[PDB]
């Protein structure tokens, strides 16, 4: 559960991502695939080499989805219903993988936004990603 201050921290921090969406999303994915090879099992059809166009395009979609979630932080289940169906009913993604990607997203943000990645912001972003993860791994209709 996000506190009112958590939501403000997330909006302020993610707003800094801006045009770096695809870039950061792509980096988080590469970090995940390299650090945790098992996660690759979900993308056997992907060219996962460094600089991969498929990874770049996919990273932008992941990042844009997070931007949408931030814009609907008060009603994420409704805003992410289609993505939940995809990850929970269709793909059946093991929840552990969301913890890994969330961690890689945090590492990416810390590496690009040192001034902004304060302990408080770090905590809020972790809770935010955990909540997004719960929604995407839940089947609620």
């Amino acid at each position: 559960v996000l506190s009112p201050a958590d939501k403000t921290n997330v909006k302020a921090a993610w707003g800094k991502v801006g045009a770096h969406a695809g870039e950061y999303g792509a980096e988080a994915l590469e970090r995940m695939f390299l650090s945790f090879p098992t996660t690759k099992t979900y993308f056997p059809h992907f060219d996962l080499s460094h600089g991969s166009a498929q990874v770049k395009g996919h990273g932008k979609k992941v990042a844009d989805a997070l931007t949408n979630a931030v814009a609907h932080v008060d009603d994420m289940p409704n805003a992410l219903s289609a993505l939940s169906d995809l990850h929970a009913h269709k793909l059946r993604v093991d929840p552990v993988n969301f913890k890994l990607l969330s961690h890689c997203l945090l590492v990416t943000l810390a590496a690009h936004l040192p001034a902004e990645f304060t302990p408080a912001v770090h905590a809020s972003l972790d809770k935010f990603l955990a909540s997004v993860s719960t929604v995407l791994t839940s089947k609620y209709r």
């Binding site: 460094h50 961690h103 972790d126």
Partner: protein, 146 residues
């Protein structure tokens, strides 16, 4: 934990730039801030009421230095982590009863702090090498649960 020559070289190169008096405190501090329940194990450390209080707490920095020292010793004994961390494992598992998931969390917070300190230098391949290291330390500390 096995690291390729390239991984070992890259890991050692990054660690050499680590500020030994502060990095451990920032790792421990962030653990206490991001995962608040961990504060229960440090009730004698005083004020942990706010993020600023936690990070500036002298006991957190002092202790974080010890934690970092343990990771350093791990780096030099990657092939015998269960032996090296035997005493610490008994301490954290049989005496303090710290749930092992928390060992994984602190390791990942350390990785975030390294990324925070070195930015672009903390490349994906460098991260992958460090994940193997923190996973190894976490496993060794949780050995009594195995």
């Amino acid at each position: 934990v096995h690291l390729t020559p390239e991984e070992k070289s890259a890991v050692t190169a990054l660690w050499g730039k680590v500020n030994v008096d502060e990095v451990g405190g920032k790792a421990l501090g962030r653990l206490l801030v991001v995962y608040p329940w961990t504060q229960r194990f440090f009730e004698s450390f005083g004020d942990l009421s706010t993020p600023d209080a936690v990070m500036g707490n002298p006991k957190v920095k002092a202790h974080g230095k010890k934690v970092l020292g343990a990771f350093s010793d791990g780096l030099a004994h990657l092939d015998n982590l269960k032996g090296t961390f035997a005493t610490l494992s008994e301490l954290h598992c049989d005496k303090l009863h710290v749930d092992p998931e928390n060992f994984r969390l602190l390791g990942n917070v350390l990785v975030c702090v390294l990324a925070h300190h070195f930015g672009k230098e903390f490349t994906p391949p460098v991260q992958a090498a460090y994940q193997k290291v923190v996973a190894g330390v976490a496993n060794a500390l949780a050995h009594k649960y195995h």
